Known about the structure:
In chain G, 36% of the residues lie in helices and 33% in strands. Chain G has 212 residues and is α+β, with helices and mostly antiparallel strands.
Amino acid sequence: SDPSSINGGIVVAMTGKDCVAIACDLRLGSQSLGVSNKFEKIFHYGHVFLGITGLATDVTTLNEMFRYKTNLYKLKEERAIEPETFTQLVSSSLYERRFGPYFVGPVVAGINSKSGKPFIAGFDLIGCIDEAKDFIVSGTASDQLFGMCESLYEPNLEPEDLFETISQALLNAADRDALSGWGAVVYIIKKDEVVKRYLKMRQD
Amino acid sequence: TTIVGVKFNNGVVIAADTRSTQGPIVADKNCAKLHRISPKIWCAGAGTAADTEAVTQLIGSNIELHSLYTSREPRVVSALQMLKQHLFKYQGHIGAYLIVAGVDPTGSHLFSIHAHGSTDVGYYLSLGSGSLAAMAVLESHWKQDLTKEEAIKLASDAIQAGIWNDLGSGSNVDVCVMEIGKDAEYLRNYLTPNVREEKQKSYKFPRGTTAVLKESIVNICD
Amino acid sequence: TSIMAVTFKDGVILGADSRTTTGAYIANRVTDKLTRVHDKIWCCRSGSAADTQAIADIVQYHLELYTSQYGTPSTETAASVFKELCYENKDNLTAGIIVAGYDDKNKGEVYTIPLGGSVHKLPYAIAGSGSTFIYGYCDKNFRENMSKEETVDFIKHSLSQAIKWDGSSGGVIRMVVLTAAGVERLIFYPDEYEQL
Amino acid sequence: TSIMAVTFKDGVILGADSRTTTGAYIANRVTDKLTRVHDKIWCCRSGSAADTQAIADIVQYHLELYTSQYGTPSTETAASVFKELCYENKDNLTAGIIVAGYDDKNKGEVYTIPLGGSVHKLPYAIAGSGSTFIYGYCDKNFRENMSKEETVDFIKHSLSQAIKWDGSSGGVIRMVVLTAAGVERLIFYPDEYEQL
Amino acid sequence: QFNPYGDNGGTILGIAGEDFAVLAGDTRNITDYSINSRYEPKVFDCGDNIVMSANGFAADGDALVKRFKNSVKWYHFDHNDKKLSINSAARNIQHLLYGKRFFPYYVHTIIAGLDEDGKGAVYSFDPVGSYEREQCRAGGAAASLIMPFLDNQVNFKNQYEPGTNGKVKKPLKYLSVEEVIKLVRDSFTSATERHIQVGDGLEILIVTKDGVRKEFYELKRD
Amino acid sequence: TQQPIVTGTSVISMKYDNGVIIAADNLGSYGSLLRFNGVERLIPVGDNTVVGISGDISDMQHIERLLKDLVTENAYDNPLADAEEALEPSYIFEYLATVMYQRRSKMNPLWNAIIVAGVQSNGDQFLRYVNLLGVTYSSPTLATGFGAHMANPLLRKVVDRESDIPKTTVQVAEEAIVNAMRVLYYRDARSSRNFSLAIIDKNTGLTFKKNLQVENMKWDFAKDIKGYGTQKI
Amino acid sequence: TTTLAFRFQGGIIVAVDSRATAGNWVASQTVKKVIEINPFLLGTMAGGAADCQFWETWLGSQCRLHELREKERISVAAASKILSNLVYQYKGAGLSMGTMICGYTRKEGPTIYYVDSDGTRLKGDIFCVGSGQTFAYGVLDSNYKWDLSVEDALYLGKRSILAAAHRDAYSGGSVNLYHVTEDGWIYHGNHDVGELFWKVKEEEGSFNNVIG
Amino acid sequence: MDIILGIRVQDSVILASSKAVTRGISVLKDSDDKTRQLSPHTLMSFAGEAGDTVQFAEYIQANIQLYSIREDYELSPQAVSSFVRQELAKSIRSRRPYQVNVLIGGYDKKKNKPELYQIDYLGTKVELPYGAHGYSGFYTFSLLDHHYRPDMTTEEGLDLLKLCVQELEKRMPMDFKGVIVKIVDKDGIRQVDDFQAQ
Amino acid sequence: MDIILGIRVQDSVILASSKAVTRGISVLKDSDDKTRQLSPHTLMSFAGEAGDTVQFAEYIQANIQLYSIREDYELSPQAVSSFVRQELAKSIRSRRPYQVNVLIGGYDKKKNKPELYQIDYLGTKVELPYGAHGYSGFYTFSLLDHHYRPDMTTEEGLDLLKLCVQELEKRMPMDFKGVIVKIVDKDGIRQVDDFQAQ
Ligand SMILES: [Mg+2]
Ligand SMILES: [Mg+2]
Ligand SMILES: [Mg+2]
Ligand SMILES: [Mg+2]
Ligand SMILES: [Mg+2]
Ligand SMILES: [Mg+2]
Ligand SMILES: [Mg+2]
Ligand SMILES: [Mg+2]
């Protein structure tokens, strides 16, 4: 019945030295039934990544909505949207539906192309913004993730290390969640380049 | 959440803790709850955060426009009247509980608005889960004619009341002083007492610890 | 909340406690429940703080305009406006208001607009949670065409009782005197009313 | 129902209206709410007529037996019985009783056993739905060690008020005087109490 | 309606080392958003080299602990001072809990000590008696935060050896009491940051052949 | 399975270097009507214990009766009734806690919150709480109802941790308790101005002050407040 | 949770997973869902952990008492009717359990009885119980033959669990195997599903949709 | 609920659907077709609430047919499904939602590959090798997961289907009166009239 | 619910009971016998709540078997049934009622006639030529009312049951996995192992 706990799924985002990372599991299920093990919850509009967890139809919808929006934004402004900007866009986009929300939990991650300052942020189903410099988590295993993060996390990690950290965080947290797992994807984002890796994990 | 507004001899100060919680989980160990409506009008909010932010920005905007149109500095009673008429419009559904303070041509003001659209005025007020711990302090040390410094301390301690005695509050203290003749000064993290101690170990994993199946470069540019 | 308005020889007085509670917590202990809708037409507010504040604000406005166009409004008219609002929106309101005003031809007048949105004109009226306790005391000690002095006391007594018994009432006693000579604000402290 | 018991110089007096209602119907307009539980220990009954009639009947017996074995019971004892019954069976009762008695050493004494089954000794007590209205008048006009005449009146006024405001009270006013000299029954009609 | 149950938060963690075991618990006791006490132990020595904690609704935790301690007393009586082995203690508790299967002890209890071979041992129970012997187990509010961590840092889950493409699991070296304690402390600090109920103090009971040793550390008070 | 009727509010208390103080107003409220004004809610048990009770009065009156019998029954065949084998605060507490926990386990609770404050024969201050659920805890300060929300924060400013107890004088503690009681009169709608305070010191023994009143109230400022927003006069 | 027991030539195969959850929270991945009643009888766990663990441990006792009274191994039929009748005494109270009582005696041969808190006692050749049942049934039904060998049969059960551990969110952890013979039962290990899925996928070629 | 199964082999997509229509206590019909041809290379099967079921499918049909005319082109299966997802995702927040679930099998003439899409009444869309709705998954997935292979022939798939249907008839409580099977491949959409025995 | 049918021809009583046991989402067993032999010339079939079903049956059996021993006599079907009605009639007003329905077919060796009794969980007992419990009646009574004749042979009845079982398998939504039939006649109780095809 809680739309936010039907399809399952988690997302996490962290910042390091001149980079940010954002990962998600791949399970799509209907209650106990695993249905697909290929449901990435991370998307990007240029150099800004949005991870969304929650009711899958909404995850899909929103993604569609932000592309549309980021697309027109690019046409009118003649430049790609920035993290900070996107963030306010997501927020305002969610509060628009304050009394009949999209049951999701978004996480933004990217690096401002001008300043180079890494950035991540998160929201609840109606736009309440959470801007922290360490990490952001969302999904059915949020509690788990916090636990892992608060312990594993330390500032200014190098891309290669942040990777491990976020993977572990994600991985072990997922292992304690019924509705999560079946695969994981991690993006390591740097000013100039972005690497995407799939993780090997328990398929149960 | 704990937010207080304390009026002093020639201005008003408002402060708040910095803990945001989803249920019993500290989501943001340092969110900001002090909003600016206009340069010299700030408010602190508790309740549904998204609502306090929304109603804040919305009114701030309409306030910025009314100013431009009237070529006059913004007035607190206007911010008040606007918030109260909007909140009231939404019969309580916009869960915003606010203490709006600020200076303007007519002097200093301090009000509180409850989500149903009722307002109150006083020399000191507080709202949030820490409401009572903080009001306890205010009811013990407040006096008429506080200096700018006495009020800051007071409002500051009160927030501490809530920080220590209320599970719903914590982390740090934010202050914003609106003195009459001067510019408003927003003291972010005026107080920082809750610092996590150095972890007992390093959980820095040795590289390669994770099992990877496939690697690939993502294309960002067009 | 304990409120009453008493009409006397020279006009009318409105009195009320100063406590607004949310459960057993005293959110505000220095609330002002005596509201000006016009120069010499004030109202006492009992019920949802939000509902009444709004209604007041609206009547205040309707009357400002009335004035601009047709001069000074009668109290009877101030009442009719309140009634109209309370009655037409009864389903979504919890407000009981007392309207008291002063006029040169009518002297003082008092109207009570109870929950259903009806209006009743009376010599004095009491309302609010604490009112239950003082119906006896009031119906007993009230005499028409009293002096300001007498009236002040009658209100100060009735309300100290109400504050005594009702926990939803307390703080200070506030009054507002409406006579030809003008408008006077009175305030009596606990240290005084508590022992009478 | 409006009932009160007032202790004075010569003892105590118990008074009550005489109306029992089922909804808005006055089932009985000449009820007697003053119950003798002992020669000089009477009680005032408010609440469920079934629940109180029974409780009284039981106390009366408990006391009759007490007497047989140990002599005349004090009022505090009559009260301890009421309390015992009322408290031990709180879940199944809706009774509020005031016990009033005369004794030579203690003069008059008044006890009120409110709904929860707790007991409180006081100079006078009032209860019943009609009580809410006269808390103010009573807390004002009551003086200790008054005369029988003064007490009768105080009681006659408080209750007329209660009868006035409360729809659940009415009929006649019944009083029962308990002093060294004996037991006197007083009755006051509507044609008298209504205009005081 | 009357609700016979309550929640007093708190969090406990038992870990069994090769030849010792620890039962750690925070010290805060709360009700809703109020702190009832900053210091109210919840992990106790039941005699016989057995430490136990019943975390959840304090009343039930209290009663259970009492009944057990007492159960130990009588066991000595009816069986010529025979030491109560941890496993025996365990089966006993199953019975205590299950005796109230239709008005349960709203608690998650754990007990630790040494088994008959002298190897560390931890057992944990359902509020109705289901039980199992375990390596490490957290219980209470912050269970969900502490468990995954332990899975990683203790049982080395998901960690593999660098350069094996994820086909060789990290070697299961066994931890010393001193190392376990670090993990415990960390577990608790981390928990303190993200869970409002956790905090104030951490009291650890260490069980070894030499008896029962207590350590205590302070935690954040907001 | 009941619902309280006549009730008593907060009972505040804290412990100082040489004893304990506890206080409680004297009100018995019937819902929102402040019905009974002469209700003592601190029950001294012997010369070394005071039991402060809030909640339902009829249930408190019962606990009273129970405490007296405890005393009486302890005298029985006890030649040391007023010495080595007299009731210690700890004994009284445990009895109470146990009763509370049983009444709740039988779904017919004693609808109360009680604080047992006293000093043990060997000198130790004793302060412990128990409520209708059998929940029990101890701390340098303790308060029930609103006192918990308002009073504790204040009192904790004096005694935040155990180490602060030996640094606190009766003068201080008593002052604190009195101020707290004043705050509650301001903020608690069910409070009453008159209260009762009791100190149990390891030397002076038990001091029980009756008929105190909240004094030194700040209300003057209420004059400079008019309207609830834009009203100027 | 997923538990199966099936009867065959060499005896009985009992295989169960080992995951316990409290909502979406995975409480444990190391639970023993097979209650070792006594050296000859096996009981499985599903429904209430306490209820099964408790009443089956107890069953373990009652059987012992019987074997002292009559000096003869209690029959599974009897063993199960005790639990069953006990369970039926509390019907309506809220017991939650569904279990297989498995045993191999001379008189009866290999036997499996399904017993549940509703008071059902049934004799059958194959039974799966738990949120992951349908998944295990799917595998069992198609590869089940009486003429199976102990090795293959163990595998079949092991796999059927695997099946369910993959698809069902509430099952997983590891598989526990038990072969029940007339001389008693023999444990055939605990196999971590993580490691097992990869191995089986690689070897068998199934779960092709999964990448690895 | 009814059974809806699909499995895309290497050169086509097979879809099987129960033939029974139940209304309360009786089985009204034992030969129902729970599918509509969207375009000549895209088929959609469906199961859900009484009217909604057909009403939704027919709507989709008409709308996909009109596009084929207006444009003189056949939308790719992918396109056809996104359209369907969007129509569902829109009704979940309407006055009265279409309680419908569908599978979409199509052969993408452009890509020269078969395609199966699963979309639930909520707008949850996903692409898979085999899929189903309702409880059908619970009994057959275990079998599919085991025996499925990307390079299956149309024949291999039909057998795997058969096996799946068998399990359903064995362990499933309701009688769905068998299935109707259709294959979607490069040459179109044909009905395997031989699935009662094959 | 399960199917419980009974039909008494001229020299015997035939009872048919579905062979399926469903627990929740799956069919656990497809070979259940929902009947117990009370005495060598009386049989009782039963349907209802999970546990109550067998428990009641077995209790009744035991008690009839005991009477048989104590008295060296076999109670008449009529007796056996009045006994059952009473037990049920007692349970409807108990703490927790057995939710069971039964059919009792017996050959009264004394009268030399077959007898079929239908008793529901409320203790409502009735004697009939043919009967069933639950919905089974709904589908078959029309058939029985039409083709039944008092002078039917054992074989004529078995066919009528067949025709009835056919209608059930056609119009009933749940798969009851077939029926087990038994005949009660002068020579005893035998199981017509040929009702899968006769
Ligand atoms: Mg969450
Ligand atoms: Mg997982
Ligand atoms: Mg699984
Ligand atoms: Mg008051
Ligand atoms: Mg009347
Ligand atoms: Mg032992
Ligand atoms: Mg914390
Ligand atoms: Mg705090």
